């Protein structure tokens, strides 16, 4: 489904940016709490999505997204 | 693309044997590079400037040698010198005059009582004599003459309580070359251990750095042999600065080319590529970049414009040829030695854990906030520019050498008693083209000396009026006492046998090579022109030989050759970017970033050097450092933009972070190696080379941490279509499915 595809894309970006395998990446966990992801890493994820695919997450909005669920929902909305 | 590597690697063993045999034949029959530079040097005074014309005409008319080299000798002791010292000095003078192939003429002053006051110090504990050697200052003949004078001095037994050293500008450059040659080996060793210690950290092996040591020393020997061959047959010329900078920059550039090569090799190994594929990907990736950057470092140096001094023309021609030899050595021997040596297991190993993530995270602060970071980087550059209002330069070389050298120690001894700029005189001439041996001409000749005196910092002039140099007034001499042997003893050292060209020996106040001391040259020329105006000397050519005018005429070319290099090197960068990449405006941005960061580099190097350490920047530290900074910053930014182009397929903004992640570790390692190798000049006995190296190293640190890191990619992000416009720009790749 679309959800699986978007989650797989995000997990591939996760593997590229900070080298954690997509296998254990699930939408039932946060970024900083578990994966030790800095605000800059999330910014890199946003830029990668914007470039490779057609999506835009404006500034002063990534902070409001804490869990993978929030990010995937926001992407699906647009 | 798979052809030149297929000729370099398949024939790796025969070409390595060829390199070894050519190095052997260039080192056994053709002398070593040090002796070749000693036998083949270039003038330190101009060849197409008024200063050199002055000395040439002076030699033509005075029959005192057709060159400008002038050395000095100091006899200092614990008490005033007695008659024993005078006898020893007379014997030494006779021995010096006996030699003819080395010394062209003797400007003896201490021997003659009438002018002995002009040699002995105020306290009477020192004296000096001026000799005129063969060949131009800093040339092979001048160095040979300096060595001959030193050997003659050491052959004789000094009287008890007095020691002898050799001073003067020609002796200063000779001892500068001696120090350069002596410290070449220690710089080689220190750089070799620095590369070892950094490879132990970036590659996790010691043999991996032993092979790099072998490669770097082989390349250094190859370039040494090539330059030795080309300078042994009188084809080109060399100098002390040319030789030392060639050697150390060759070591730094060879080790940086190796860093790029085996770092892309390390990246290939991390990506799973084998040896034979890592070799070809390394070539296709960085061999063209190395070629472009070597051609830049060669073309910019060679195109240091046709300047008054060989210290630019023949500092850029042999440097360009040496850099061509070094880039050829890279492109041929490096791949071959790699293919033959890194074919054994457990010799290379990658360390990629903690360096690929901190260069990809900093890359995210360039594309999501391109504005704030770009303006911040430009603000840092402008803050560096903020000290331009208080920028200073110093043309002196005594302050840029250790005190343990014979020349600098003689300067210290002279300064202990003399409080002047005595060891660096200045000569002015006026060709009246008629006999200047009448009373009226002598009365009016002192006008030029007095007019020169009016300028600040020329408080004493050793003119024809009196060697003492005390400015009393315009002397007048009766015609009856005009012609006597005693007066002729000095009149042959002041005016031509018939009288064509005058000489005005001049001693400055304080540092003669300072900004004021060199701005004094224009004032001297204007005063001379005004003095000859309205007098029978009108229409004469005011040629100003010496050292202060030598530096003035040479520094007049600073703007000229800087602009011409900033045209030619940037045009070559244009060509390289259009060939191995596709853009025209970005070929201008890649050099605009560097020229903007030049202000920050200058600010950092003047805060570190002048504000803290209290030492200003030598004029050679301006031109050479700026041009090498342009070339090497262009190398780094060119590697960055080449990687960006290789990663444009996935997007522009994402290409920036991809290139940063993929290139940051290697570029940082190379920049640290280059910076520390250049900073190794701090123990080079050449503090001017230390300033050049430290300035270049700090500029490269600022480039590898700020400019290349954020400033260039921020601009690339802000202007997307205007950065690859000729090749057509789609900022995002055509939208792809998930």
Author numbering:
A (entry chain I): 3 to 80
B (entry chain D): 21 to 493, 688 to 952
Copied sentences from the primary study:
Clinical bedaquiline resistance is primarily caused by mutations in the transcriptional repressor Rv0678 which result in upregulation of the adjacent MmpS5L5 operon. MmpS5 and MmpL5 form a complex that functions as a multidrug efflux pump which confers resistance to bedaquiline and other hydrophobic drugs, as well as exporting the iron-scavenging siderophores mycobactin and carboxymycobactin. MmpS5’s operonic partner, MmpL5, is a 12-TM Hydrophobe-Amphiphile-Efflux 2 (HAE-2) subfamily RND transporter that is evolutionarily divergent from the well-characterized gram-negative HAE-1 efflux pumps. MmpS5 is a small (~15 kDa) single helix transmembrane (TM) protein containing a C-terminal immunoglobulin-like (Ig-like) domain.
To determine the architecture of the MmpS5L5 complex, we purified Mycobacterium tuberculosis (Mtb) MmpS5 and MmpL5 ∆494-688 overexpressed in Mycobacterium smegmatis (Msm) by affinity purification using a C-terminal GFP-FLAG tag on MmpL5 followed by size exclusion chromatography. Cryo-EM single particle analysis revealed both monomeric MmpL5 and a subset of trimeric MmpS5L5 particles. To address preferred orientation, data were collected at 0°, 20°, and 40° tilts, yielding 3.2 Å maps of both monomeric MmpL5 and trimeric MmpS5L5. MmpL5 possesses two periplasmic α+β sandwich fold “porter” domains (PD1 and PD2, respectively), with one present on top of each 6-TM bundle. Our cryo-EM structure resolved the core TM and periplasmic domains but lacked MmpL5’s unique 196 amino acid insertion within periplasmic domain 2 (PD2), which is predicted to form an extended antiparallel coiled-coil with a disulfide bond at the tip. We observed density on the cytoplasmic face of MmpL5, which we assign as the endogenous Msm acyl carrier protein AcpM (MSMEG_4326), since a similar density was observed at the corresponding location in the monomeric cryo-EM structure of the MmpL protein MSMEG_1382 from Msm. AcpM interacts with MmpL5’s basic cytoplasmic Iα2 helix and MmpL5’s unstructured C-terminus (residues 946 to 952), which forms an extended interface with AcpM (Right). A distinct nonprotein density is clearly visible within this cavity in both apo and bedaquiline-saturated trimeric structures, suggesting that molecules can enter this cavity. Crucially, the monomeric MmpL5 structure derived from the same cryo-EM data lacks this kinked TM2 helix and the putative substrate density. This suggests that trimerization induces a specific conformational change that opens this entry cavity, potentially facilitating substrate access from the inner membrane leaflet.
